[PDB]
């Protein structure tokens, strides 16, 4: 039986087939592992093989170098480190060769590279790997498939290996990563992979963001990537904008007004959930930040010293624009339930709530007008919106400021509790369930 054949039977629809292929490949790993890893790795490398087999092979390598279970993961990484060095050099090569020689899109090689780098970079046993990959991205004569395969591998390593293990090689990786995102880069498949690796590289790139020169460049490449017509990129591009807002709030005052604001706001409005959800996520992070900041401030006040860092009250500022966009998104509610299911609505709720606890004061006045106008609306959607909007701001604003509004609204509220709509009925239950638990 050629290995190719067994690899293939791991997808066979026949339940027996599946079985055999599985036990045969399971014994192999536990009884001829060095050989097994070499053959497999040889399969993965030959463009003459089927997407099916090439991929099955790759998986078998990954599943022998990593697990989701921490205890097994180490065991495997130990088992590998203790294999003959040459055999591991032989495998390390076929894998690394495969880069750029794959037809199918999700690179079966990338997983392998990370699965080994994860066990060898920490004991300096594969020092060629990083500079190598960095080159595949930076050599101009490099094929697109090369740059994509590689950028994906960089991403997995950036993702599965401790960030401290790459702090000394940040610069190189960042260059290669940003290279794949430049406007000039043709293939969006590459631009995607590159942007996806950048997301995991933020943790160990602090050095770079602190240098006004470089950071200024990164925000450009990221911002321009949010324009890429390939949605898939536009999403990952915003994903970085969000994670950055979190890690580098202090450096943002330069980009916030002249670009970030417009981008994220349009983002919260695209009909494409995947996108909207990211725009929302953005501000929800600004809030977490500006609240922790207000706390740090309240603590330095009781020390007679200015606070280390300072809020710029972006949330409080965008409040006039955020609220109407959020309340309206509370309209686009999915009729057949998406119960826990994270859609633009559920998120726009959580956000409004975060705003209310972040601007205990300024919030109520921007939301109220919407509530009053649509509380008695014929459309169950806009109605439910008003009901939710109200129950959202119930936490944060001074109790004294809320009590009058509660009481003067309690009538129509309790009535909504038995509204014809089954959705308004649950919402009205929640809002009322809050007006209690929050203030008897």
């Amino acid at each position: 039986m050629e290995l190719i054949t067994i690899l293939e039977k791991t997808v066979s629809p026949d339940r027996l087939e599946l079985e055999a292929a599985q036990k045969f490949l399971e014994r192999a790993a536990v009884e001829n592992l060095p050989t097994f890893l070499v053959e497999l790795s040889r399969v993965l490398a030959n463009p003459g093989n089927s997407q099916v087999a090439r991929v099955a092979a790759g998986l078998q390598i990954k599943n022998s170098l990593t697990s989701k279970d921490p205890d097994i993961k180490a065991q495997y990484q130990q088992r590998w480190l203790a294999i003959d060095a040459n055999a591991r050099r032989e495998v390390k090569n076929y894998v690394l060769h495969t880069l750029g020689t794959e037809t199918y899109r999700p690179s079966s090689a990338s997983q392998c590279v990370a699965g080994i780098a994860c066990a060898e970079i920490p004991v300096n046993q594969w020092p060629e790997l990083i500079p190598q990959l960095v080159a595949n991205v930076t050599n101009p004569n490099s094929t697109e498939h090369m740059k994509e395969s590689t950028l994906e591998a960089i991403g997995y390593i950036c993702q599965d290996i401790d960030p401290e293990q790459l702090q000394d090689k940040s610069n190189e990786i960042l260059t290669a990563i940003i290279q794949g995102m430049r406007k000039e880069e043709p293939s969006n498949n590459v631009k995607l992979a590159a942007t996806n690796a950048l997301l995991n590289s933020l943790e160990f790139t602090k050095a770079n963001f602190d240098k006004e020169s470089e950071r200024h460049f990164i925000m450009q490449v990221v911002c321009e990537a949010t324009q890429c017509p390939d949605t898939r990129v536009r999403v990952a591009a915003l994903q970085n904008l969000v994670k950055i807002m979190s890690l580098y709030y202090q450096y943002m005052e330069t980009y916030m007004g002249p670009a970030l604001f417009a981008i994220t706001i349009e983002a919260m409005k695209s009909d494409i959930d995947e996108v909207a959800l990211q725009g929302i996520e953005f501000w929800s992070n600004v809030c977490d930040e500006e609240m922790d900041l207000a706390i740090e401030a309240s603590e330095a006040a009781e020390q007679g010293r200015p606070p280390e860092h300072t809020s710029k009250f972006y949330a409080k500022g965008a409040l006039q624009y955020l609220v109407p966009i959020l309340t309206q998104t509370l309209t686009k509610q999915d009729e057949n339930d998406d119960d826990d299911d994270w859609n633009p609505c559920k998120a726009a709720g959580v956000c409004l709530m975060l705003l209310a606890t972040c601007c205990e004061d300024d919030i109520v006045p921007h939301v109220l007008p919407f509530i009053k106008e649509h509380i008695k609306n014929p459309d169950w959607r806009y109605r439910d919106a008003a009901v939710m909007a109200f129950g959202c701001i119930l936490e944060g604003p001074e109790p004294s400021q809320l009590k009058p509004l509660v009481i003067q609204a309690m009538p129509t509220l309790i009535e909504l509790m038995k509204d014809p709509s089954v959705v308004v009925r649950d919402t009205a239950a929640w809002t009322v369930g809050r007006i209690c638990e929050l203030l008897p």
Binding site: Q179, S213, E214
Partner: peptide, 22 residues
Amino acid sequence: DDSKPAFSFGXXXXXXXXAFSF
């Protein structure tokens, strides 16, 4: 082809603004 250079992160140089761009 006279293809693009490559920005290097490493050795660089850190009454109105000259802000930011696209």
